[PDB]
């Protein structure tokens, strides 16, 4: 719905990286995997966390 706070599998906080992940892509033009490695998310478990989140809240907040 919203970034999850930690990697399901390792504990790494990952909830504090979504803003940035998305600024890394749209503002500084990185491909999704150099981006993720910039955030330090270098095991595949945390990668998948960022890489597959879907921000559904964004669509929830359009309702009044």
Partner 1 sequence: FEDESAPITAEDSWAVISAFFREKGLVSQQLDSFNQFVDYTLQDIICEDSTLIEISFGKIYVTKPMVNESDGVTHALYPQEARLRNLTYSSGLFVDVKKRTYEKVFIGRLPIMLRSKNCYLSEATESDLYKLKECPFDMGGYFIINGSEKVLIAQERSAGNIVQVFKKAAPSPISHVAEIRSALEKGSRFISTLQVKLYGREGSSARTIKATLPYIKQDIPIVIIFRALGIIPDGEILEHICYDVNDWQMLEMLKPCVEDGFVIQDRETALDFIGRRGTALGIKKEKRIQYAKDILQKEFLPHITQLEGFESRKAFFLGYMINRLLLCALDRKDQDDRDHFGKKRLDLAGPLLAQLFKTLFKKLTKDIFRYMQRTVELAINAKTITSGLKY
Which residues, numbered 41-60, are part of the site for partner 1 (CB under 8 A)? 59
Distance (Å, whole) CA 37 – CA 35? 5
Q: How many CA atoms lie within 13 A of 35 on its CB side?
A: 19
Q: With CB cut-offs between 5 and 8 Å by kind, which of Zn ion, partner 1, none does residue 62 bind?
A: partner 1
Near Zn ion by CB under 5 A, which window of 7-15, 18-26, 28-36, 56-64?
Answer: 7-15
| CA distances in angstroms from 15 to 1, 53, 62, 63, listed in the order given | 12, 11, 22, 24
Q: Does 63 bind partner 1 (CB under 8 A)?
A: yes
Residue 57 annotated as binding site: no
Binding residues for Zn(2+): 7, 10, 45-46
């Amino acid at each position: 719905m919203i970034v999850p706070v930690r990697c399901f599998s390792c504990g790494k906080v990952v909830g504090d990286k979504w803003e940035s992940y998305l600024n890394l892509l749209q503002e500084d033009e990185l491909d999704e995997g150099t981006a993720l490695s910039r955030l330090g998310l270098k095991r595949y478990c945390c990668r998948r966390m960022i890489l597959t989140h879907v921000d559904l809240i964004e669509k929830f907040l359009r309702y009044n």
